[PDB]
Design a protein around this ligand. Structure first.
Ligand SMILES: CCCCCC(=O)N(O)[C@H]1CC(=O)N(c2ccc(Cl)cc2)C1=O
Ligand SMILES: CCCCCC(=O)N(O)[C@H]1CC(=O)N(c2ccc(Cl)cc2)C1=O
Ligand SMILES: [K+]
Ligand SMILES: [K+]
Ligand SMILES: [Zn+2]
Length: 395
């Protein structure tokens, strides 16, 4: 069973932010336009018995003072009440400013992603679903006491905490254009959550981490945080060859109980960032290559969204990821028309109204040797036994 998180209230909240507007509606409506919803099990967002239960859940990671501030920000924006100088200073102390400003539903909006991803984790734990998709989740930058990169609450960290707290190891794979710093930091000292981010890094590029400083964890979590920074311009094939052996080696050595994949769509060639040149093509899209490989491991998996600022092309990609997941999990052939079906947001898919995006297409060897060494160090530190040459052969 492949699950997907949605709901009427969830849709309105996921569409209430100024930065991401109606992206989630385009995504879910295109999935619906392609007749995928009857193939999927709807997973409703988690709700709580009381304010105290909600607060307990969110402060499993975030600080009480930060959650207090995020609630107050919504309350202030809920009225005409412009912030006092003291309130501005309070918000600044949590980076609830500039790129992460307040809006009338900022706490409800960020809490909704947490509700969705926690529900997804529970459905995996109870084995109701083999894979769960949450295209309203994936906010990998939020820190314990700091908003960052349009992320206010870290739904990923809270979902992973629910998985490991259910011997359990989690592999987190972050495919976003940006380094998954918030998730990496949360599990820096934890050997049982191994994090792996592939991303662009360059001077002045957000958030700045995930590159040479390589730090890789600390304490009992030493060697447990993996990173592969790539230069601008990389295409589907080169990105696939860069991460492919790393993914397979992580699965062999870690033997994870769960995999959590952040599938931010800002690596697409048509994203306004214009840094990587990945596609959604399925003849092959780097995203689909990676997701297909992860799903072949037959490990219960959470697939999350993230970045993606070209909303129709994000919808194009995530619709294909959803169909691929159905096909790989259920063994059911999926046939998506190359033409965008008529539906509410059909006019947004100009100019050609095709499902393919409108695009025409040894430093990594050193990184591979470095990561192989780090994997061996992780395995030694943690008394894990693994076929050294079967893993080296992957590269
Ligand atoms: C969780 C994924 C979506 C939101 C975060 C993310 O992964 N995004 O896609 C980037 C895009 C971008 O340009 N930023 C950014 C740049 C500079 C500054 Cl200062 C703050 C934010 C992000 O956070
Ligand atoms: C020092 C600090 C730390 O975390 N450790 C450690 C202990 C046990 C294991 Cl298994 C791994 C690391 C030290 O020895
Ligand atoms: K990433
Ligand atoms: K870790
Ligand atoms: Zn991003």
């Amino acid at each position: 069973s492949v699950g997907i998180v949605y709901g009427d209230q969830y849709r309105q909240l996921c569409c209430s932010s100024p930065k991401f507007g109606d992206r989630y509606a385009l995504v879910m409506d295109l999935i619906n336009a392609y007749k995928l919803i009857p193939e999927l099990s709807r997973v409703p967002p988690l709700q709580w018995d009381s304010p105290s239960r909600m607060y307990e859940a969110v402060t499993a990671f975030h600080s009480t003072e930060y959650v207090d501030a995020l609630k107050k920000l919504q309350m202030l924006h809920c009225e005409e009440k412009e912030l006092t100088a003291d309130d501005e200073l309070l918000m600044d102390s949590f980076s609830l400013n500039y790129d992460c400003p307040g809006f009338p539903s900022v706490f409800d909006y960020s809490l909704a992603a947490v509700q969705g991803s926690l529900a997804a984790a529970s459905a995996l734990i109870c084995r109701h679903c083999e894979v769960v998709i949450n295209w309203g989740g994936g906010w990998h930058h939020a820190k314990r006491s700091e908003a960052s990169g349009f992320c206010y609450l870290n739904d990923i960290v809270l979902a992973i905490h629910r998985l490991v707290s259910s011997q359990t190891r989690v592999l987190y794979v972050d495919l976003d254009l940006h380094h998954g710093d918030g998730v990496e930091e949360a599990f820096w000292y934890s050997p049982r959550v191994v994090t792996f981010s592939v991303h662009h890094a360059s001077p002045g590029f957000f958030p700045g981490t995930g590159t040479w400083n390589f730090l890789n964890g600390a304490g009992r979590g030493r060697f447990s945080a993996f990173n592969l920074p790539l230069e601008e311009g990389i295409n589907d094939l080169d990105w696939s060859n860069a991460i492919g052996p790393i993914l397979d080696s992580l699965n062999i050595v870690i033997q994870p109980s769960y995999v959590v994949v952040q599938c931010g769509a800002d690596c697409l060639a048509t994203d306004p960032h214009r840094i990587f040149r990945l596609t959604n093509f399925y003849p092959l899209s780097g995203y689909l290559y990676a997701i297909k490989k992860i799903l072949s491991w037959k490990v219960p998996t959470l697939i999350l969204g993230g970045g993606g600022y070209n909303f129709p092309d994000t919808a194009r990609l995530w619709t294909r990821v959803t169909a691929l997941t159905i096909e790989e999990v259920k063994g059911k052939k999926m046939t998506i028309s190359p033409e965008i079906p008529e539906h509410s947001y059909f006019s947004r898919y100009g100019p050609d109204f095709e499902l393919d995006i409108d695009y025409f297409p040894d430093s990594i060897q050193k990184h591979h040797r470095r990561i192989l060494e780090q994997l061996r160090n992780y395995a030694d530190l943690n008394k894990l036994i693994y076929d050294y040459d079967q893993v080296y052969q992957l590269y």
